[PDB]
Amino acid sequence: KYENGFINAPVVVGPDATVADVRRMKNEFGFAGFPVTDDGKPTGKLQGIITSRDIQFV
Amino acid sequence: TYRDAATALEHLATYAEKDGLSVEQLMDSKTRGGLTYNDFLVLPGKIDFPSSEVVLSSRLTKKITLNAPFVSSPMDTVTEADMAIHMALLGGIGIIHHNCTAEEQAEMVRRVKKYENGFINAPVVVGPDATVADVRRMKNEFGFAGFPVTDDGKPTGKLQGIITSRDIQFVEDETLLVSEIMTKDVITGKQGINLEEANQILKNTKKGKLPIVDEAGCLVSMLSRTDLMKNQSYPLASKSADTKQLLCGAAIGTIDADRQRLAMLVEAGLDVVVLDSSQGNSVFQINMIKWIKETFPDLQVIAGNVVTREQAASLIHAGADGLRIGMGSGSICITQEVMACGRPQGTAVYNVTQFANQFGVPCIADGGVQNIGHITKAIALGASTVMMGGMLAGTTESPGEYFFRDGKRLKTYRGMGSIDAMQVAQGVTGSVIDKGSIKKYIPYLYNGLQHSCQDIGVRSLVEFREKVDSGSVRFEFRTPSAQLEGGVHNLHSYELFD
Amino acid sequence: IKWIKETFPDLQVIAGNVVTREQAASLIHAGADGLRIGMGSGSICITQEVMACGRPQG
Amino acid sequence: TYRDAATALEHLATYAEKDGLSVEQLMDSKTRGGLTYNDFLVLPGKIDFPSSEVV
Amino acid sequence: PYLYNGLQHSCQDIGVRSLVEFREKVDSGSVRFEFRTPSAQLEGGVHNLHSYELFD
Amino acid sequence: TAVYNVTQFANQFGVPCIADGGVQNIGHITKAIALGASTVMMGGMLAGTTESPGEYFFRDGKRLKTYRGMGSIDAMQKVAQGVTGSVIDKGSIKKYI
Ligand SMILES: Nc1nc2c(ncn2[C@@H]2O[C@H](COP(=O)(O)OP(=O)(O)O)[C@@H](O)[C@H]2O)c(=O)[nH]1
Ligand SMILES: Nc1nc2c(ncn2[C@@H]2O[C@H](COP(=O)(O)OP(=O)(O)O)[C@@H](O)[C@H]2O)c(=O)[nH]1
Ligand SMILES: Nc1nc2c(ncn2[C@@H]2O[C@H](COP(=O)(O)OP(=O)(O)O)[C@@H](O)[C@H]2O)c(=O)[nH]1
Ligand SMILES: Nc1nc2c(ncn2[C@@H]2O[C@H](COP(=O)(O)OP(=O)(O)O)[C@@H](O)[C@H]2O)c(=O)[nH]1
Ligand SMILES: Nc1nc2c(ncn2[C@@H]2O[C@H](COP(=O)(O)OP(=O)(O)O)[C@@H](O)[C@H]2O)c(=O)[nH]1
Ligand SMILES: Nc1nc2c(ncn2[C@@H]2O[C@H](COP(=O)(O)O)[C@@H](O)[C@H]2O)c(=O)[nH]1
Ligand SMILES: Nc1nc2c(ncn2[C@@H]2O[C@H](COP(=O)(O)O)[C@@H](O)[C@H]2O)c(=O)[nH]1
Ligand SMILES: [K+]
Ligand SMILES: [K+]
């Protein structure tokens, strides 16, 4: 999973998740590029994306 | 029969003195005299706070204060730009060596000052007629890839767009012009805006840069997102309160030629100068000090080296803003064996600072420092900061090429008085073991000093200074047997950080 | 120490480590039933070199 | 508060003795006695001449 | 000449222009001294190096 | 001798062979391939590099990493045919390889 062309089952986050949750996810995986789906599942409806820049200075 | 335990604290008053020695009694030679760090200990006190609460704010000079009492020595095997940059970021400061041409030293100072910025002065720019090949050559040279695009290719030119690493990153045709690949619509800040205002706009855009332009649309300055990141990652960084640039120190001699050298260092943005000498109490250095205060009145001057009260008085009278203490205490130094002249570092620090502190002149304890214990004791005896040479040699930020010998990873470390460096030697050439990055090593020293203050029962170095002078902090001599017992002993083998 | 004497009054408490008169007085006042003396005197210990803090054991 | 630096040389007179020991005090055994070269140092002073001038 | 030059620099650091002056300033108590504990002697010499290598 | 005699047989079946063990330098790699090996396996040479697990410690004035055989008692504990030892630091394999 270190290098991909098409990433399978990318890590995602729900809209109701907090910045605290996203930072905890960044430390764990550890990247900060999580698309946002409505149900918080990888197969869910895309509603946006959150990146490192988005949470860097929150 | 036995006294009631409830009377334990009250019974302490029946004793004429607190247990252990005052700093006065310790250094009241006597009987015994001429001691160094390893000859004594600081006795523990009362803990009523966490070590994380301990403040290590320290005066480098009259007007300069650091968040940590750590100073890297001006030696060609310890402090160049890389060293000085990271010392400043981690709350200390670096003194750039002068075993080099004036131009080379000024360049090192300049790189330290330009490493972090608030408003970038004269940012690197590119013209629209430049090629991708040119931009890549610029990236390699500076090297950063964010360049605003001006019509004339001057920092003061009319802004027409911006070129970033992402823009050139996967361009196959290097002949393409900047005008073709650049981003034309760029968010800018208006001239006259202050730093806090400019930063917010930058934070809102989420872009790499924020160019500042005048009403005519000409570039005047620029912000960088990474500067905000650097501030966030290094909140204790030693920086100018106005420019946000890292503080930088540099060493010079006291000959007439160093006047031109210093002028070049000041132009590069030097914040503090160290007059480098094994015996600073000279007419030569005194004249240099006087010349600096009238020529560069805003430049802080550290004089030295000194080890006696008389030396200190002489240079303080000359106008020194700080003092460098140590003669022969250096790991790679031999002045005492060659000149018969020097002083045990512990006694030197005490007797000099006992005089100098009365004048609000901070003193650097220079040489003989190898561990956290040495740092604590130096400060206990009156030092405001400690200078480290050998301890920082062999770190990745140190300027050296690692070589292998005796099955050990080594870096060369040499005294500035050694014949090799000058090319009667007062230093020698040697090697030191690898230690890794100071990004780990300095926080270890920082954390260690906090715990040391905690055990002693002081919440800051300011408090530490006060409680020692008042006789509240207590000390104890170490016989040769006590020192062996104090260190590792009676083991077949043994293996601090990481 | 105080919490132990009121919770487990029959339990003997040894406090420490200490090396000064003042430390001893403090913990004795707290109710210590015994004291442990030593700081840096340990064969495998380095507190004195790392903390600049300790005392010759004698 | 801090003393004025201009009074630094004048303030030296408030001390009973110069910093360090006299040769008499060094060799006034005592306590300590029976020392050799490696047991002591000479403290530095004031430089107002080049070493080449030394006779 | 190395010893000669070295002794000149040593006199300079002490602040005396000759051995005659050196003798006088010591006897008058102007030249000052300091004991060296065993720790100070180790600190005064080369210390804490993996290896090391005066004249020539 | 092991690499030569095995590969002289294995090459006839198009089966590539790894030369595992005894490799310490570029010369060993060359000779192993010369004798018929298709690749070389390195253990000790890569131990002590930054990308290798786990943590460095200092002994005898040298920066070391623990290096042990899978047949050592320590390894089998989560008749020994291996031992536990140490190797010097080597830095990143991004430079070493
Ligand atoms: N997304 C993605 N594309 C890749 C990756 N590796 C190679 N490619 C694409 O594969 C194509 C050709 O790659 P090539 O240069 O032959 O190297 P190779 O794919 O590593 O064999 C190019 O379009 C690359 O951008 C990867 O890790 N991720
Ligand atoms: N963002 C993300 N990256 C993944 C995932 N799984 C594997 N990766 C890889 O991890 C790397 C992360 O990209 P990077 O730009 O370094 O970090 P990010 O921008 O914070 O996501 C890429 O090379 C991905 O191919 C995943 O679920 N999410
Ligand atoms: N781009 C740029 N950076 C500078 C200049 N002068 C100093 N710097 C510093 O270099 C750093 C730029 O790093 P970064 O923005 O990540 O690199 P870039 O995105 O490729 O420009 C900032 O911290 C600046 O303070 C300059 O003229 N141009
Ligand atoms: N629209 C617009 N694009 C910009 C601005 N600043 C930079 N860009 C472009 O957006 C892309 C990403 O730039 P940036 O994130 O600053 O580059 P990085 O610092 O290399 O990550 C590049 O193609 C830039 O030319 C801006 O203010 N507005
Ligand atoms: N652009 C920029 N702003 C800075 C820098 N250093 C401090 N600041 C700003 O100074 C203001 C005060 O922040 P401050 O509390 O000093 O943060 P700290 O320096 O981490 O303690 C904030 O707007 C910071 O963003 C820098 O290097 N660059
Ligand atoms: N006399 C003398 N002192 C030196 C020389 N090089 C470095 N020093 C001193 O030794 C200190 C470094 O000591 P270390 O940190 O290695 O124990 C420096 O701060 C500097 O004052 C030299 O060549 N001669
Ligand atoms: N018999 C035995 N072989 C081992 C053990 N541990 C490792 N080896 C082998 O020794 C090789 C290591 O060779 P090196 O690169 O250290 O010279 C490994 O690739 C593996 O094949 C062990 O405990 N017992
Ligand atoms: K010990
Ligand atoms: K020395």
Author numbering:
A (entry chain A): 115 to 172
B (entry chain B): 2 to 424, 446 to 517, 520 to 522
C (entry chain B): 290 to 347
D (entry chain B): 2 to 56
E (entry chain B): 465 to 517, 520 to 522
F (entry chain A): 348 to 425, 446 to 464
Paper quotes:
The enzyme IMP dehydrogenase (IMPDH, EC 1.1.1.205) catalyses the oxidative reaction of IMP to xanthosine 5′-monophosphate (XMP), which is subsequently converted to guanosine-5′-monophosphate (GMP) in a reaction catalysed by the enzyme GMP synthase. The reaction catalysed by the IMPDH represents the rate-limiting step in guanine nucleotide biosynthesis and hence IMPDH is an essential enzyme that controls the cellular pool of guanine nucleotides, playing crucial roles in functions such as the immune response or cell proliferation. IMPDH forms tetramers in solution, each monomer consisting of a catalytic and a regulatory domain. The regulatory part, ∼120 amino acids long, is inserted within a loop of the catalytic domain and is composed of two repeats of the cystathionine β-synthase (CBS) domain, constituting a CBS pair or Bateman domain8.
We were also able to solve the structure of full-length AgIMPDH, co-crystallized with GDP at 2.25 Å resolution. The crystal belongs to the space group P4 with four monomers in the asymmetric unit (AU), each of them located around a quaternary symmetry axis that generates a tetramer. The electron density for the Bateman domain of each of the four monomers in the AU was clearly visible, including three GDP molecules (see below) and the linker regions that connect the Bateman to the catalytic domain. Surprisingly, although it was not added to the crystallization drop, unequivocal electron density for GMP within the active site was observed. GMP is most probably the product of GDP hydrolysis with time in the crystallization conditions. Thus, AgIMPDH octamers are observed within the crystal lattice, assembled as dimers of tetramers that pile up tail-to-tail. The dimers of the tetramers of AgIMPDH are mainly stabilized by an interface that involves the Bateman domains from the upper and the lower tetramers, which associate to form an antiparallel arrangement that buries a surface of ∼8.800 Å2 per monomer. Interestingly, the β-phosphate of a GDP molecule contacts the side chain of Arg167 in the adjacent Bateman domain, further stabilizing the interface. A direct consequence of the interaction of the Bateman domains is that it brings the finger domains of the monomers from both tetramers into contact and arranges them into four pseudo-β-barrels that further associate around the fourfold axis, contributing to the stabilization of the interface by burying a surface of ∼5,000 Å2 per monomer. In our structure, we found three GDP molecules bound per Bateman domain: two of them (GDP1 and GDP2) were bound to the canonical nucleotide-binding sites of archetypical CBS motifs, whereas the third one (GDP3) was bound to a previously undescribed site.
